[PDB]
Design a protein around this ligand. Structure first.
Ligand SMILES: [Ca+2]
Ligand SMILES: [Ca+2]
Ligand SMILES: [Ca+2]
Ligand SMILES: [Ca+2]
Length: 144
């Protein structure tokens, strides 16, 4: 949108575009993944380009990288938000929300819930049947 934001995205496009032609190819994408210790085969390189390549020419140009980056940054916010919210519920930092933790946070939000009502709410969200809410079960409830 602003000139500074465009500048910063051009700098990120530039580490992927190794030869400076304005396009990122499966081989340039590959050179980047290899430098980060991952060595993909030409097949999953192709799947990665296909996701971002909107005109079908087999490469990625700057408009197409800009759309990807922008969409990816809205998604990464939605995650940051859901991780923060889970972490306020998991008072002891063990990865699981228990009935006591949820009840304690609900009373601080203004809602005094009995053990039967809190148990109903855990039972609804619990998929693996341990009577706790893990992160997966939490995001799945934050939609559904
Ligand atoms: Ca290139
Ligand atoms: Ca393209
Ligand atoms: Ca916990
Ligand atoms: Ca569970």
């Amino acid at each position: 949108l602003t000139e500074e934001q465009i500048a910063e995205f051009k700098e990120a496009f530039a580490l992927f575009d190794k030869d400076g032609d304005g396009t990122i190819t499966t081989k340039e994408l590959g050179t980047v993944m290899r430098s980060l210790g991952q060595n993909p085969t030409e097949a999953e390189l192709q799947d990665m380009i296909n996701e971002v390549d909107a005109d079908g020419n087999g490469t990625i140009d700057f408009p197409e990288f800009l759309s990807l980056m922008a969409r990816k940054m809205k998604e990464q916010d939605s995650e940051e938000e859901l991780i923060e919210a889970f972490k306020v519920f998991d008072r002891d930092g063990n990865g699981l929300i228990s009935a006591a933790e949820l009840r304690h946070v609900m009373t601080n939000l203004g809602e005094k819930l009995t053990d039967d009502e809190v148990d109903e709410m855990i039972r609804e969200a619990d998929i693996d049947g341990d009577g706790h809410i893990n992160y997966e079960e939490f995001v799945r409830m934050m939609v559904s």
